[PDB]
Design a protein around this ligand. Structure first.
Ligand SMILES: CC(C)(C)C[C@@H]1N[C@@H](C(=O)NCC[C@H](O)CO)[C@H](c2cccc(Cl)c2)[C@@]1(C#N)c1ccc(Cl)cc1
Length: 84
């Protein structure tokens, strides 16, 4: 319900994944990031909850080389450091 403003670099990732605006609900951000993950096939083939991103823009924005899609509190925290 409350809205968030992604910083410019996060925003650019979201638009590369189909976002067509600049303010979002957390849910919409998570959705486009999920699609971005799928589109770049950042997930591990065998351990599919794991995202490899040391060589991806997301890795630098999130400050991690790997993380799990199931780590929701951690994912919120990584996203929050990229919201205005
Ligand atoms: C599966 C897919 C497409 C990557 C989407 C994920 N799929 C959501 C997820 O938890 N998948 C694992 C479910 C597990 O197998 C138990 O059933 C994940 C998500 C959903 C809601 C809140 C958060 Cl914080 C994260 C996911 C979404 N949507 C996601 C979005 C962005 C990021 Cl950065 C990481 C995970």
């Amino acid at each position: 319900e409350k809205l968030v403003q992604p910083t410019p670099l996060l925003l650019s990732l979201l638009k590369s994944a189909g976002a067509q605006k600049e303010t979002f609900t957390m849910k919409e951000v998570l959705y486009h990031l999920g699609q971005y993950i799928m589109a770049k096939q950042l997930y591990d083939e065998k351990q599919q909850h794991i995202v490899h991103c040391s060589n991806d823009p997301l890795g630098e924005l999130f400050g991690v080389q790997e993380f799990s899609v199931k780590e929701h509190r951690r994912i919120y925290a990584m996203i929050s450091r990229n919201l205005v």
